A paper describes a structure:
Herein, we report the crystal structure of AgPPO8 at 2.6 Å resolution, representing the first structure from a recombinant PPO and the first from a mosquito species. The crystal structure of AgPPO8 contains two identical subunits, each comprising 700 residues, which are associated tightly to form a homodimer in the asymmetric unit. C592-C636 is situated on the surface and exposed to the solvent, while C594-C643 is located at the interface of domains II and III, which may contribute to the structural stability. The overall structure of AgPPO8 homodimer closely resembles that of MsPPO heterodimer, with a 1.14 Å root-mean-square deviation over 1,129 aligned Cα atoms. Each metal ion is coordinated with the NE2 atoms of three histidine residues, which are highly conserved in this protein family: CuA is associated with H223, H227 and H252, while CuB is associated with H379, H383 and H419. All six histidine residues are located in the α-helix bundle from domain II, and stabilized by three Phe residues (F99, F248 and F415) through hydrophobic interactions: F99 with H379 and H383, F248 with H227, H252 and H379, and F415 with H223, H252, H383 and H419. The distance between the two copper atoms is 4.5 Å, which is the typical distance for the reduced form of type III di-copper proteins. The UV/Vis absorption spectrum did not exhibit any apparent characteristic feature from 250 to 700 nm, supporting that the AgPPO8 structure we obtained was in the deoxy state. As seen in other arthropod PPOs and hemocyanins, AgPPO8 also contains a putative ‘placeholder’ for phenolic substrates, which is F99 in each subunit. Interestingly, the analysis of the AgPPO8 structure revealed a prominent cavity in the di-copper reaction center, which is close (~1.5 Å) to the solvent-accessible surface.
Author numbering:
A (entry chain B): 3 to 64, 69 to 578, 588 to 697
B (entry chain A): 1 to 58, 66 to 579, 588 to 628, 633 to 697
The structure:
Amino acid sequence: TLTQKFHGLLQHPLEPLFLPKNDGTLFYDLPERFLTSRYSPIGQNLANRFGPNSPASSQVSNPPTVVTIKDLDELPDLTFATWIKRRDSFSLFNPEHRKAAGKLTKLFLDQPNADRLVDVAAYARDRLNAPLFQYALSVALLHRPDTKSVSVPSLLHLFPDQFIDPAAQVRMMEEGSIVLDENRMPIPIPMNYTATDAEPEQRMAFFREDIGVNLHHWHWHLVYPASGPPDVVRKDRRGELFYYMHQQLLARYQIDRYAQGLGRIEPLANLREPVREAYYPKLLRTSNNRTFCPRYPGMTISDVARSADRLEVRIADIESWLPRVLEAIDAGFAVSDDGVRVPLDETRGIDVLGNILERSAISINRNLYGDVHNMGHVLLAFIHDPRGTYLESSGVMGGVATAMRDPIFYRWHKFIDNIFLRNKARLAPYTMAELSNSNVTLEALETQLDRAGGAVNSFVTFWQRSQVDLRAGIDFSAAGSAFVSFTHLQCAPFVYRLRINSTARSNRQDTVRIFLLPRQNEQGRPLSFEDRRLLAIELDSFRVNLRPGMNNIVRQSSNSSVTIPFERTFGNQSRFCGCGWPAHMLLPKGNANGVEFDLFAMVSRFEDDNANVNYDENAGCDDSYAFCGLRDRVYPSRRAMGFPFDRRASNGVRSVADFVAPYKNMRLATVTLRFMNTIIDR
Amino acid sequence: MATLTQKFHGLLQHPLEPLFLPKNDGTLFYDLPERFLTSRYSPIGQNLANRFGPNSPATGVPPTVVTIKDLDELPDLTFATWIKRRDSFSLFNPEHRKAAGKLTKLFLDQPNADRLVDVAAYARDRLNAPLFQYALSVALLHRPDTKSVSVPSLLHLFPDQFIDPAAQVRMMEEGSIVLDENRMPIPIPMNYTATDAEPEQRMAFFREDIGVNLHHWHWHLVYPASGPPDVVRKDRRGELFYYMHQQLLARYQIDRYAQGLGRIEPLANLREPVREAYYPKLLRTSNNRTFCPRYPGMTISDVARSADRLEVRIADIESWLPRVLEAIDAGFAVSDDGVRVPLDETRGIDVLGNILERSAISINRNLYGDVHNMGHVLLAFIHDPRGTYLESSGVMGGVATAMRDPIFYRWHKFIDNIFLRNKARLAPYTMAELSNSNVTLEALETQLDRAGGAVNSFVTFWQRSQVDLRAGIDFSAAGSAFVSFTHLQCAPFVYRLRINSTARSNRQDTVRIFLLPRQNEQGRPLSFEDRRLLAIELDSFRVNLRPGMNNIVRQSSNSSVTIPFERTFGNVQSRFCGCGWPAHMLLPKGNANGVEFDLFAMVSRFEDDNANVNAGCDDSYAFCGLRDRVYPSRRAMGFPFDRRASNGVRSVADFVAPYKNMRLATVTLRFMNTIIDR
Ligand SMILES: [Cu+2]
Ligand SMILES: [Cu+2]
Ligand SMILES: [Cu+2]
Ligand SMILES: [Cu+2]
């Protein structure tokens, strides 16, 4: 298969191609000059010891597959990426690193066919920075028409050192070296891993340091990058999706802070004040053994000038870019670099602001509005060595797949979020036309645990212990499995029971929108309505064919358009499938006393909802629309993401009851979320 | 005793590789009783024997099998098991020292050497690796029936305490892919912890030198602060503690001046922010917990880490220091029995040494506390004082790593200034003590050891050396694991001394050689007091002076201060042999412009110079003394510069003018910025 030929490249990054891939089953016949300077002199010896005919290759079929690599008519220019050494640290928040990624990605997309891509990718692999190569090749495989159905491995199986406690990984080296795969045991990773309960922020470790959550963040930015070739970047409403996905992250994050006795997120607005929160990642780059350096308590952010990284940005740069962005928001319009005024007070205004604020390549004015969000990561990621004097690499905030582990990630994004919200606050409240559905009434809203005698309007969360083989990302290891054991949040399966009456004569492809709204803060005091609204988290959105008369609709929690199955996250199928909220993180954790939520359901009108896209949510990879949208297609809800809660409500509205009182297509259900402090195996 | 080294060698290598795995690259094997295997591997004991036994599919020689006898009863190891097998280990942690002591005691308490092997084999795979290797090392050095058992240096046990992990991980690729016959040394750079933008980086050749750090570790191994009584109580260890570090600081200071850096700022104020930063890069292979860096301007916090059973406050040092200062100022200290112990003597510095470190033989643990050691603690856990963030010690919490940190020299200068407060009270040496009326030193000279060799001219440069770290790297490929590193090196030379004796019979007098600096970093001349405090010992040795004129030639390689390259970086010769300043660091680096020193030589009288004690391991007494013997010089260590001179002395010339048994030679030290292979 074509997937087979690429698979060998997309694994064991620092293990060269002349070494057998896929547990000594997949081999590569390389032109001599494909081997790098070091290994070329012993090329024949390498073939004898690690070839398809080697004395090690004899007993593997107790098969084998050989991939033939054609020589290139001319060797491609890789000078653009050569300044980044094969084992150097790599940061996607480094503009010069993104630039190197873009050109390599472009080089891959520009190949005449898929088979010549294999050749060029095979040549570049061992001559190139592993994170850089793996990223570009991944992006190219997701966008080339002739590789549409090529399965690509998750980052978990490429660079496990960005997700796993290195203490666990090194303990695994002993288990593999000594014990046969037949007898091996998973090395367990603890919950108290970056801090003890003495640190209040550790309460959110189930969220921040969740492997699934970080994989989602990485995959989202993979699908929707800020740079690269134009067609790779330009995707439907990526600017708006940038705001929304992170807005929902913060909302879910905040809700559980309230549930764990933690207060409201303090926005990181003052970059010259000391950074209160500390964080010690412990994560370690296997390639150079350079850590994701920790941030000690109360450090002050410095101007970053790191010539070795070709990286440079001052605090004042952000302090100069932000008033211009705020003024544009307050003026109701932005100005492109050609001087055409672009309105912001629209439904699509949040999307222009998204590309401006991140920023992305399709921003309408790079110079005026700068690069606020991205450079904020840079300043924080190199706070421990801003000038490169001490030869350290980025902290977790300088890694897309690791940034969510740092408490400061949510403080910084809350600042970014409040900028988007400054724009959303200007929008007029949704009208009678937009909110009502006069032929459709929602008569019954319910949740029931998917079992016999299942409790009604009752959510239950607990600890699940799962296993995963990290075999593919561990270089120069033993053979066989490299299982690890980790513990994470998990909720009990349930269904939505909706009874919907339609007095219309014909069928309506209406959309059902389900949200969860919190009631109290950490004090146990009720939140203002606006606070409840801003903390509304999407649980599900789906179309239903309401026949006239009575409809009884039952919706499986497992079919959430927000989440993806465990196997989509941790398994070994493009990387779009890797994008999506982890299923086991569908509901907030809550506590053992019980947290009461307002379950909200709405039946909106297909007339306002459709953008003419056809997808089967139970087919392919189209079941993670909420955060990821659809692959190579437009976002199937014409409504603003977050509808109907992305806008401020009318005057005199003070409850979720008030908000839904005038509309019979809406209904609330009081649901209780309770956490059970026990570990259940998968 | 040769085969006895074999049985211990397998224990003294690949620490986290259990004993059922073939040692010495599949040459040395161990036949273990089934209950010697730990809980995890016991159920698969038979499979492990099939795959890793002497007859498994794993030179020309039949392998060696060591048969381990079962124990009459299993020993209680619970005292040390709270320190997990892969946990971090710090000898500045009193509780860890306590655990080390008891394990050493269990080892010393064994009836014979062979029975020690049995107990050591049992404890090995059940115990914290740094802890086990240390205890076993110490015990093998003190047991009479193991007195000539060779023990590997820490370089071949835990290379991750000496080597940039970036280099080590690169080495992992080279071993896995390339046959041993074709392998290449992985080069380690000198600039790796900081760039030239950090002024302190100029001293990286000193602080981060592998040889220099190995010396520090071996010295403390030979002269520990804790453990069984016979292991601690050694001749003038307290004074040697002061002198060895006083000389470290002096040499360190001399090169700062040479690199444009100022004088060492004492770490006297523990509550003001610590200016100097340091990023070790070093990594513990066992748990992948770094020797955490110290960012610029951090403030020291009270340390309370229940997981480490470790707790010490800044206020404790602020309470211990006045008590020590009052004793020095009183001229006497007070033991825990209320017996007054004089300090205004030649041996007072030795009492003060045990008080300040402190050691187990301190005369009053409660009153004077534990200043020097706890200072290490406060600094080593500055990044996680309460253990909230589950991090381990920085480099200051590792004996073999502490010297890499710039703050080590600031802290020790503080300690040094307390010792010097006592040394300043002592009366200046008299004519009787300093003169030698039957002996005249007429000519002092150094010549580079070659044909046409330059005279009174020192030359330093970079040497590129290799060392096989094979033995300390667990679960790696087989065969060599060579590395390439660069370090200071000086050109070989000789001392030419012409000595006339008007005595009628022979005298076995002593020649004492010191190097004294002249200028600071500005280029301004040092006061005599500054020159005296920076006097560094280069050599001290006896000489047989026949009546009349004697012509003495002394090889620089025969320095009583240093030890050969092979003693530092070699492998299987006890661990006393590991103690000793590195030969290649005999002279300061200097600069490329040239630095002028006053080479000082003295011929003191054997009548004062003799305690009643150089082809074995007795060539490093200056810092290490002699193994199982007394310090071969009766004079205070540093003589004649450990005491301030007469009131009328204002130059180095004045100090030596009244004594004809002394002579100065002006010597130039010049650095050559070039790398020469070994
Ligand atoms: Cu993001
Ligand atoms: Cu971000
Ligand atoms: Cu020391
Ligand atoms: Cu010390």
